[PDB]
Amino acid sequence: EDPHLRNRPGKGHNYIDGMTQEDATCKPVTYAGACSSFDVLLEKGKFPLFQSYAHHRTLLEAVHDTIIAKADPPSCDLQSAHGNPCMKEKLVMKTHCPNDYQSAHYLNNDGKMASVKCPPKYELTEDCNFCRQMASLKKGSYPLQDLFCQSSEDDGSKLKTKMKGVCEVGVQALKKCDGQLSTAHEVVPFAVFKNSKKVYLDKLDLKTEENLLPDSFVCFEHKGELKSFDISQCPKIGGHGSKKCTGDAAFCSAYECTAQYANAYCSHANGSGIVQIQVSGVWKKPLCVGYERVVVKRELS
């Protein structure tokens, strides 16, 4: 029912630095065109958390909107002899890469965007851990995690993973465990906050406060086919702008509506709003929330 999933909050840039050959349809993503770093997120059921929060930012969008910092280095060369800095974090993740990707990206333990990358024209293997030779490569990067992001000033410097009975989750050793342990790949929820590391969680509990801020709207104009349109051009009631706009009841409560004189139509974005997450009993406003499938070791005997 939502026809505006490609009408992106923010700049809407779904490319990774160093892979710019599909900028025409990824920078920004919009109604028209294919984008190998974004289109996979909308395949029904593949990325269920993002699809529940699809008017929030992807990881690449959050990087280009300066909400999430890039890791140093920003891509790891999987081919390199004697290693790369991503290998430990990547190996504890169980991931499936489709064929023909040169790059795949993820939110690392420090809360920054890292990526693994193959040479030309090498593709990642199915487990995303190696490169192999391949008609032609995709021009973007495969998102390894199901997540979504938003801006936040809420300090998470005292927040840390606390998981009952867990000794290790991903690359995080949580506590001393000298007994015999059990091991499994688990799909674990996590969040990243201002000034925190990745916080893995026993349970994902989210709430959304809807509002009438700009990222709560999607605006479109007619290509002279729909085209994404920036609401910042639209005058507020009592204010000025550079364009004429119209929209739904929520839009017209705050913005001028000029009906048949409008250059664009704006409507409230389904599911948008400020997201908070419950973490060790307290609600906090995260930068990003997601799931990843990682090795987990639990106390046993």
Numbering used by the authors: 154 to 287, 290 to 379, 393 to 469
Reproduce, without paraphrasing, sentences from the article in which this PDB structure was first reported:
Rift Valley fever virus (RVFV; genus phlebovirus, family Phenuiviridae) is an important example of an enveloped virus that harbours a class II fusion protein. As with other phleboviruses, RVFV displays two glycoproteins on the lipid bilayer envelope of the virion, Gn and Gc, which form higher order pentameric and hexameric ring-shaped assemblies. Virus entry is completed upon Gc-mediated fusion of the viral envelope and host cell membrane, in a pH-dependent mechanism.
Although, residues 154–560 were present in the RVFV Gn construct, electron density corresponding to only residues 154–469 was observed, indicating that the remaining 91 C-terminal residues were likely cleaved during crystallogenesis. RVFV Gn adopts a novel fold comprising 15 β-strands, 5 α-helices and 4 310-helices. The protein can be divided into three domains: a predominantly helical N-terminal domain termed ‘domain A’ (residues 154–305), a β-ribbon domain (residues 306–365 and 440–469) and a small globular domain termed ‘B’ (residues 366–439). Superposition analysis revealed a high level of structural similarity between that Gn structure and the one reported in this study (0.4 Å root-mean square deviation between 261 pairs of C-alpha atoms, respectively).
